[PDB]
PDB file of C-alpha atoms in Angstrom:
ATOM      1  CA  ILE B1062       4.459  13.472  -6.267  1.00 40.88           C
ATOM      2  CA  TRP B1063       6.108  16.867  -7.622  1.00 38.93           C
ATOM      3  CA  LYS B1064       3.385  18.935  -6.282  1.00 38.87           C
ATOM      4  CA  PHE B1065       3.810  17.062  -2.963  1.00 40.54           C
ATOM      5  CA  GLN B1066       7.552  17.640  -2.922  1.00 42.79           C
ATOM      6  CA  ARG B1067       7.330  21.296  -3.680  1.00 45.19           C
ATOM      7  CA  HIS B1068       6.629  22.162  -0.031  1.00 44.00           C
ATOM      8  CA  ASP B1069       9.776  21.267   1.946  1.00 41.00           C
ATOM      9  CA  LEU B1070      11.973  23.103  -0.536  1.00 38.47           C
ATOM     10  CA  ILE B1071       9.814  26.123  -0.090  1.00 38.03           C
ATOM     11  CA  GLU B1072      10.080  25.642   3.655  1.00 38.07           C
ATOM     12  CA  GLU B1073      13.859  25.694   3.479  1.00 38.59           C
ATOM     13  CA  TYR B1074      14.571  28.782   1.492  1.00 42.33           C
ATOM     14  CA  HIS B1075      12.027  30.760   3.275  1.00 43.45           C
ATOM     15  CA  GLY B1076      13.758  29.655   6.391  1.00 41.56           C
ATOM     16  CA  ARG B1077      17.387  29.897   5.595  1.00 43.52           C
ATOM     17  CA  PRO B1078      19.115  33.220   6.670  1.00 42.72           C
ATOM     18  CA  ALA B1079      19.582  35.841   3.806  1.00 40.79           C
ATOM     19  CA  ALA B1080      23.337  35.522   3.314  1.00 37.96           C
ATOM     20  CA  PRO B1081      24.824  33.858   0.129  1.00 39.67           C
ATOM     21  CA  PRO B1082      28.078  31.929   0.560  1.00 41.03           C
ATOM     22  CA  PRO B1083      30.317  35.213   0.095  1.00 42.71           C
ATOM     23  CA  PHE B1084      28.783  36.773   3.238  1.00 43.20           C
ATOM     24  CA  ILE B1085      27.735  33.475   4.811  1.00 42.85           C
ATOM     25  CA  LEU B1086      30.493  33.212   7.141  1.00 40.87           C
ATOM     26  CA  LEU B1087      29.440  36.225   9.368  1.00 43.41           C
ATOM     27  CA  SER B1088      26.082  34.459   9.304  1.00 42.91           C
ATOM     28  CA  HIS B1089      27.616  31.299  10.414  1.00 40.38           C
ATOM     29  CA  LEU B1090      29.470  32.839  13.132  1.00 36.03           C
ATOM     30  CA  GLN B1091      26.512  34.901  14.123  1.00 36.41           C
ATOM     31  CA  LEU B1092      25.065  31.414  14.522  1.00 32.97           C
ATOM     32  CA  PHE B1093      28.000  29.847  16.489  1.00 31.19           C
ATOM     33  CA  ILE B1094      27.902  32.609  19.107  1.00 32.88           C
ATOM     34  CA  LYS B1095      24.293  31.665  19.957  1.00 33.88           C
ATOM     35  CA  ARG B1096      25.474  27.897  19.645  1.00 35.00           C
ATOM     36  CA  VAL B1097      28.006  28.652  22.430  1.00 35.86           C
ATOM     37  CA  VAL B1098      25.695  31.172  24.130  1.00 33.31           C
ATOM     38  CA  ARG B1105      10.215  29.597  13.709  1.00 31.25           C
ATOM     39  CA  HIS B1106       8.505  32.282  11.538  1.00 33.30           C
ATOM     40  CA  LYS B1107       4.999  33.812  11.722  1.00 34.38           C
ATOM     41  CA  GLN B1108       4.598  32.556   8.188  1.00 34.58           C
ATOM     42  CA  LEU B1109       3.871  28.895   8.775  1.00 31.03           C
ATOM     43  CA  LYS B1110       2.583  28.971  12.542  1.00 31.74           C
ATOM     44  CA  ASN B1111       0.715  31.482  14.371  1.00 32.72           C
ATOM     45  CA  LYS B1112      -1.581  31.708  17.383  1.00 32.67           C
ATOM     46  CA  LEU B1113      -4.662  33.805  16.895  1.00 33.37           C
ATOM     47  CA  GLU B1114      -6.958  35.830  18.964  1.00 32.30           C
ATOM     48  CA  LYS B1115     -10.156  34.498  20.722  1.00 26.43           C
ATOM     49  CA  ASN B1116     -12.463  37.074  19.097  1.00 25.74           C
ATOM     50  CA  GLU B1117     -10.808  36.369  15.615  1.00 26.00           C
ATOM     51  CA  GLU B1118     -10.508  32.705  15.929  1.00 26.41           C
ATOM     52  CA  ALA B1119     -14.106  32.294  17.160  1.00 26.89           C
ATOM     53  CA  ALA B1120     -15.637  34.047  14.254  1.00 28.12           C
ATOM     54  CA  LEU B1121     -13.395  31.858  12.140  1.00 30.01           C
ATOM     55  CA  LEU B1122     -14.571  28.678  13.663  1.00 33.12           C
ATOM     56  CA  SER B1123     -18.248  29.521  13.444  1.00 33.32           C
ATOM     57  CA  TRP B1124     -17.513  30.405   9.817  1.00 35.92           C
ATOM     58  CA  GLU B1125     -16.190  27.000   9.259  1.00 30.33           C
ATOM     59  CA  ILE B1126     -18.861  25.106  11.095  1.00 31.44           C
ATOM     60  CA  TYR B1127     -21.530  26.758   8.870  1.00 32.22           C
ATOM     61  CA  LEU B1128     -19.692  25.730   5.775  1.00 32.14           C
ATOM     62  CA  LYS B1129     -19.145  22.271   6.766  1.00 31.44           C
ATOM     63  CA  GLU B1130     -22.916  21.815   7.205  1.00 32.97           C
ATOM     64  CA  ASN B1131     -23.417  23.062   3.784  1.00 32.84           C
ATOM     65  CA  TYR B1132     -20.936  20.463   2.461  1.00 30.58           C
ATOM     66  CA  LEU B1133     -22.802  17.687   4.295  1.00 31.54           C
ATOM     67  CA  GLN B1134     -26.111  18.573   2.533  1.00 33.65           C
ATOM     68  CA  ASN B1135     -24.641  18.589  -0.986  1.00 35.15           C
ATOM     69  CA  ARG B1136     -23.036  15.273  -0.329  1.00 35.51           C
ATOM     70  CA  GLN B1137     -25.943  13.333   0.706  1.00 34.67           C
ATOM     71  CA  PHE B1138     -27.976  15.150  -1.947  1.00 35.03           C
ATOM     72  CA  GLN B1139     -25.824  14.021  -4.942  1.00 35.81           C
ATOM     73  CA  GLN B1140     -25.994  10.540  -3.138  1.00 34.40           C
ATOM     74  CA  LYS B1141     -29.666  10.660  -4.061  1.00 38.97           C
ATOM     75  CA  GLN B1142     -28.852  10.782  -7.909  1.00 38.21           C
ATOM     76  CA  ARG B1143     -26.545   7.799  -8.281  1.00 40.53           C
ATOM     77  CA  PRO B1144     -28.735   5.637 -10.730  1.00 42.14           C
ATOM     78  CA  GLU B1145     -27.950   2.459  -8.771  1.00 41.42           C
ATOM     79  CA  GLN B1146     -29.433   4.054  -5.829  1.00 39.76           C
ATOM     80  CA  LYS B1147     -32.577   5.143  -7.831  1.00 41.30           C
ATOM     81  CA  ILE B1148     -33.183   1.532  -8.849  1.00 45.15           C
ATOM     82  CA  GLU B1149     -32.957   0.295  -5.418  1.00 43.40           C
ATOM     83  CA  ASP B1150     -35.680   2.886  -4.567  1.00 43.17           C
TER      84      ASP B1150
ATOM     85  CA  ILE R1062       4.457 -14.428 -18.825  1.00 45.65           C
ATOM     86  CA  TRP R1063       7.539 -13.559 -16.975  1.00 46.38           C
ATOM     87  CA  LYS R1064       5.983 -14.225 -13.539  1.00 46.41           C
ATOM     88  CA  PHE R1065       5.060 -17.670 -15.063  1.00 46.15           C
ATOM     89  CA  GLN R1066       8.652 -18.325 -16.379  1.00 45.21           C
ATOM     90  CA  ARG R1067      10.098 -17.313 -13.089  1.00 45.57           C
ATOM     91  CA  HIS R1068       9.286 -20.753 -11.544  1.00 46.46           C
ATOM     92  CA  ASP R1069      11.462 -23.306 -13.565  1.00 45.83           C
ATOM     93  CA  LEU R1070      14.474 -21.396 -13.249  1.00 49.03           C
ATOM     94  CA  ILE R1071      14.106 -21.565  -9.450  1.00 48.18           C
ATOM     95  CA  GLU R1072      13.426 -25.195  -9.575  1.00 49.00           C
ATOM     96  CA  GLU R1073      16.614 -25.513 -11.323  1.00 49.75           C
ATOM     97  CA  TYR R1074      19.177 -23.574  -9.194  1.00 50.37           C
ATOM     98  CA  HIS R1075      17.360 -25.054  -6.129  1.00 51.18           C
ATOM     99  CA  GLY R1076      17.932 -28.496  -7.468  1.00 49.63           C
ATOM    100  CA  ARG R1077      21.506 -28.308  -8.941  1.00 49.18           C
ATOM    101  CA  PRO R1078      24.269 -29.574  -6.618  1.00 47.89           C
ATOM    102  CA  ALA R1079      26.284 -26.805  -5.067  1.00 50.04           C
ATOM    103  CA  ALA R1080      29.518 -27.115  -6.991  1.00 52.26           C
ATOM    104  CA  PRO R1081      30.551 -24.194  -9.367  1.00 51.87           C
ATOM    105  CA  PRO R1082      32.516 -25.290 -12.488  1.00 52.45           C
ATOM    106  CA  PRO R1083      35.904 -25.232 -10.602  1.00 50.46           C
ATOM    107  CA  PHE R1084      34.822 -27.918  -8.255  1.00 47.49           C
ATOM    108  CA  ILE R1085      32.236 -29.317 -10.481  1.00 46.97           C
ATOM    109  CA  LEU R1086      34.239 -32.083 -11.769  1.00 48.13           C
ATOM    110  CA  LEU R1087      34.208 -33.933  -8.375  1.00 47.46           C
ATOM    111  CA  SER R1088      30.501 -33.423  -8.468  1.00 48.57           C
ATOM    112  CA  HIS R1089      30.183 -34.799 -11.975  1.00 51.95           C
ATOM    113  CA  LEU R1090      32.212 -37.890 -11.092  1.00 49.57           C
ATOM    114  CA  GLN R1091      30.375 -38.310  -7.708  1.00 46.96           C
ATOM    115  CA  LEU R1092      27.504 -38.455 -10.188  1.00 49.12           C
ATOM    116  CA  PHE R1093      28.859 -40.955 -12.657  1.00 47.16           C
ATOM    117  CA  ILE R1094      29.914 -43.309  -9.834  1.00 47.35           C
ATOM    118  CA  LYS R1095      26.051 -43.683  -9.045  1.00 46.96           C
ATOM    119  CA  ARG R1096      25.324 -43.536 -12.996  1.00 51.08           C
ATOM    120  CA  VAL R1097      27.573 -46.572 -13.243  1.00 52.57           C
ATOM    121  CA  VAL R1098      26.441 -48.058  -9.868  1.00 52.29           C
ATOM    122  CA  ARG R1105      13.538 -34.976  -5.206  1.00 50.49           C
ATOM    123  CA  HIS R1106      13.819 -32.590  -2.343  1.00 52.86           C
ATOM    124  CA  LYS R1107      11.403 -32.119   0.669  1.00 49.69           C
ATOM    125  CA  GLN R1108      10.975 -28.600  -0.681  1.00 50.66           C
ATOM    126  CA  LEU R1109       8.473 -29.064  -3.405  1.00 47.93           C
ATOM    127  CA  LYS R1110       6.905 -32.471  -2.622  1.00 51.72           C
ATOM    128  CA  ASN R1111       6.181 -33.842   0.752  1.00 52.49           C
ATOM    129  CA  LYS R1112       3.752 -36.284   2.203  1.00 55.77           C
ATOM    130  CA  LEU R1113       2.045 -35.262   5.255  1.00 51.92           C
ATOM    131  CA  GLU R1114       0.598 -37.008   8.469  1.00 48.20           C
ATOM    132  CA  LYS R1115      -2.965 -38.177   8.732  1.00 50.75           C
ATOM    133  CA  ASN R1116      -3.479 -36.095  11.998  1.00 53.09           C
ATOM    134  CA  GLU R1117      -1.951 -33.083  10.288  1.00 50.58           C
ATOM    135  CA  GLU R1118      -3.406 -33.447   6.870  1.00 52.01           C
ATOM    136  CA  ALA R1119      -6.911 -34.139   8.191  1.00 54.91           C
ATOM    137  CA  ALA R1120      -7.074 -30.945  10.119  1.00 55.72           C
ATOM    138  CA  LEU R1121      -5.686 -29.194   7.050  1.00 54.51           C
ATOM    139  CA  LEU R1122      -8.612 -30.369   4.847  1.00 55.20           C
ATOM    140  CA  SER R1123     -11.246 -29.645   7.264  1.00 56.04           C
ATOM    141  CA  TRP R1124      -9.734 -26.268   7.478  1.00 56.60           C
ATOM    142  CA  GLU R1125     -10.003 -25.754   3.724  1.00 63.31           C
ATOM    143  CA  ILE R1126     -13.409 -27.182   3.537  1.00 62.50           C
ATOM    144  CA  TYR R1127     -14.610 -24.689   5.907  1.00 61.64           C
ATOM    145  CA  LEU R1128     -13.163 -21.821   3.755  1.00 62.49           C
ATOM    146  CA  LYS R1129     -14.401 -23.028   0.441  1.00 66.31           C
ATOM    147  CA  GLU R1130     -17.812 -22.831   2.092  1.00 65.88           C
ATOM    148  CA  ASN R1131     -17.073 -19.185   2.918  1.00 63.69           C
ATOM    149  CA  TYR R1132     -16.113 -18.250  -0.641  1.00 64.48           C
ATOM    150  CA  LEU R1133     -19.184 -19.973  -2.023  1.00 65.91           C
ATOM    151  CA  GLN R1134     -21.418 -17.593   0.057  1.00 67.26           C
ATOM    152  CA  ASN R1135     -19.541 -14.454  -0.941  1.00 64.84           C
ATOM    153  CA  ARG R1136     -19.797 -15.368  -4.546  1.00 63.92           C
ATOM    154  CA  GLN R1137     -23.528 -15.845  -4.933  1.00 69.43           C
ATOM    155  CA  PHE R1138     -24.152 -12.876  -2.652  1.00 71.73           C
ATOM    156  CA  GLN R1139     -22.145 -10.423  -4.763  1.00 75.38           C
ATOM    157  CA  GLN R1140     -23.962 -12.123  -7.697  1.00 73.60           C
ATOM    158  CA  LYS R1141     -27.060 -10.544  -6.175  1.00 72.64           C
ATOM    159  CA  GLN R1142     -25.808  -7.070  -6.730  1.00 73.05           C
ATOM    160  CA  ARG R1143     -25.204  -7.064 -10.568  1.00 73.89           C
ATOM    161  CA  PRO R1144     -27.469  -4.279 -11.523  1.00 76.66           C
ATOM    162  CA  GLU R1145     -28.532  -6.168 -14.564  1.00 72.94           C
ATOM    163  CA  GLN R1146     -29.724  -9.035 -12.287  1.00 78.68           C
ATOM    164  CA  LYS R1147     -31.565  -6.554 -10.010  1.00 76.70           C
ATOM    165  CA  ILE R1148     -33.402  -5.156 -13.108  1.00 74.29           C
ATOM    166  CA  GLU R1149     -34.628  -8.860 -13.923  1.00 76.13           C
ATOM    167  CA  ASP R1150     -35.855  -9.078 -10.435  1.00 73.65           C
TER     168      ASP R1150
END
């Protein structure tokens, strides 16, 4: 649960503008001027050439995972007795 | 043990007449007048038409339970080795 919670905290303090409460009022008014008139850290489009290679890479490894799974399924003693 | 105990308490405070100790004396005397001269909540007869359908319903499900029991008996590895 703690490891789970850890996120949103990080999300916040990475998101909040860098102005402690002393100099926070200039930030608040720099906000209300747009109130009257995300980041590349947690969400970013990619490029076809780049993304493609990435997906192919994954596809490969998913197949790998599949094999190991069913193989180790072949070792379960109960399954062996059934054989 | 606690879950067990929980009952009789419920039985009591569902049974006791609704009169806290202020107005409990009128209740006590309303009792002693009958002392000188259950609820449908925990015990109630039923109707043949209704009860019958109920019993049949159960009968059915008991059979169901029976099957699942002996079937899962067929999976006990020790039993399989015996086979």
